[PDB]
């Protein structure tokens with residue numbers, strides 16, 4: 001197995017489908033990564049996450065460096081062994097979630113000391129497969145001046161991240177490193193950022209700084225010009241996106257990888273994704289509904305339990321309600337990704353996207 | 362399959378091992394029943410409860426009549442279909458948990474109107490396999506006068522329960538009815554109660570009114586004289602017991618069936634049962650312990666995850682921690698029951714009980 005090989009099997013417009021081969025497994029793209037914040041995808045055993053179709057999960061340099069600790073996890077054999085997930089793990093770099101749960105920022109990093117060097121080292125200690133460069137995210141809205149400052153600092157930090165990763169042989173040989181494009185909503189800054197990142201060279205390229213309050217039309221407008229700026233032959237990762245319709249439109253714009261807490265977090269709060277749009281299972285109208293969460297869904301939850309039962313569990317505060325809702329929503333997201341992949345392979349993704357939107361809305 | 366057939370395969374002292382055959386499955390005895398209060402064994406899918414070795418689970422006329430409602434569950438197809446457990450379910454009668462979460466008691470029942478007739482009807486609506494007579498539990502300590510009054514009322518209610526069950530053909534043909542001995546800690550009242558219940562006739566006989574604050578020596582003293590009073594050829598159910606050592610000693614005294622919330626409830630609070638006694642996984646000493654919860658346990662949790670990981674999850678408030686702890690503890694209890702059954706079958710239970718106690722303590 002190679003350290004890293006991204007291959008594109010089929011294309012339609014700007015959409016692509018293919019594979020990322022890594023030492024710990026193959027990632028089918030476009031890919032959705034369930035988020036495992038504190039070394040768990042909330043309310044799911046790893047075998048259940050896998051059974052839903054996930055090829056890779058996300059972790060975070062922030063939560064884990066705080067609890068249980070990066071050195072501790074390394075002593076215990078690494079994150080994979082610790083949590084019982086033996087396939088690829090992408091780790092975020094930790095900037096984003098510092099500025100989460102008395103920040104002091106400087107050119108050296110953030111204290112709260114998380115620098116580019118320490119972030120890459122933590123991700124090493126965790127045994128991450130896909131390491132994210134340490135960046136500064138840029139709040140929305142941002143003035144051009146502030147967006148430029150943040151983007152420029154992130155590009156200096158992208159070079160520091162590259163060099164920290166490459167200087168550590170076991171990491172450089174076994175893991176991959178992704179860079180993160182910044183620039184807010186501004187085309188010229190997005191272009192400077194893409195060019196800086198391509199000059200350094202990375203295994204993949206994330207679009208950072210979106211899904212921070214701008215809303216879908218604007219996100220899509222920025223993706224329209226931003227994704228083409230990135231090297232075509234490397235994966236394109238849209239960080240922190242998103243809703244099902246966000247994912248479809250982002251794939252239409254050349255994104256290959258996604259993560260978001262919506263299916264887990266919103267699942268525990270009672271929101272179930274269906275092909276006919278989201279439902280909130282707490283609604284009284286579900287109290288005697290014997291149908292599954294979604295009429296077509298192949299997941300184990302929909303094979304076995306009714307809306308009425310899940311309604312009762314969520315109303316009652318029961319753990320099994322969180323478990324069932326989360327499994328269904330992660331399974332739904334993976335079925336979406338499978339339908340996206342298949343439709344691109346068959347040259348009918350544009351039609352799939354049309355049909356999906358007509359019915360989901 | 363018969364409605365009900367209890368067979369004793371092997372005996373040692375007062376201990377017995379055998380089977381209860383019912384329409385929905387066979388129950389191996391001595392049996393431990395996980396408790397499923399609000400139509401769920403907390404933090405476990407039913408398939409997981411089964412995989413641990415459980416043959417039967419417990420539900421409760423109280424919680425379910427309140428939420429989601431007995432008539433509602435019947436409309437939805439019964440408790441088995443609702444929660445996805447297709448094997449036997451024993452339901453408690455609801456008295457106990459009323460006097461749980463402005464009570465008005467009378468000879469007719471309790472208002473808060475739960476009468477013997479309504480309790481048996483609710484258990485019908487739920488589709489219970491083993492229906493408990495509606496009783497009055499008697500607080501501990503109890504004066505002889507108050508214990509006698511409560512016991513006498515419970516025996517009048519036991520006859521009302523019998524007659525309500527028998528007058529409903531589908532229930533009488535497909536379910537079983539257990540009576541509940543009362544009398545507090547008093548031998549003469551226990552004898553009157555046993556005699557009253559045997560005169561009415563039941564499919565099984567519970568020992569009620571224990572594990573309410575008296576402590577193990579006293580419980581065992583009362584079991585010593587109380588269990589022999591019950592018909593030998595019917596199951597003996599000790600309600601709400603107990604800790605592993607409580608179970609062993611109760612089997613030594615002729616009990617065949619058990620339920621308790623300890624493995625579920627205490628599991629979510631961090632207590633793990635092991636052959637070397639309970640541990641509290643929240644203790645800092647487990648933060649880097651790579652051993653499984655218990656060194657011999659065959660459960661899936663112990664095959665896959667470390668104390669260190671479960672420690673982290675419970676400290677972090679994570680749902681997966683509750684899931685793992687609960688699975689392990691229910692699996693532990695079922696392995697205890699299997700070792701009890703096998704040792705009685707092989708004529709070496711007294712030695713097993715010795716050995717168990719030496720090491721657990």
Ligand SMILES: Nc1ccc2nc(N)nc(O)c2c1
Nearest residue numbers: 096137208209210211239240
């Ligand atoms: N919307 C997102 C989510 C995660 C991110 N993480 C990093 N490191 N940088 C960003 O821009 C992110 C944006």
Ligand SMILES: Nc1ccc2nc(N)nc(O)c2c1
Nearest residue numbers: 457498569570571572600601
């Ligand atoms: N310790 C227990 C637990 C459950 C009981 N339920 C009923 N109906 N009656 C009792 O005496 C109980 C005692």
Ligand SMILES: [Zn+2]
Nearest residue numbers: 297299302328
């Ligand atoms: Zn589903």
Ligand SMILES: [Zn+2]
Nearest residue numbers: 658660663689
């Ligand atoms: Zn175990």
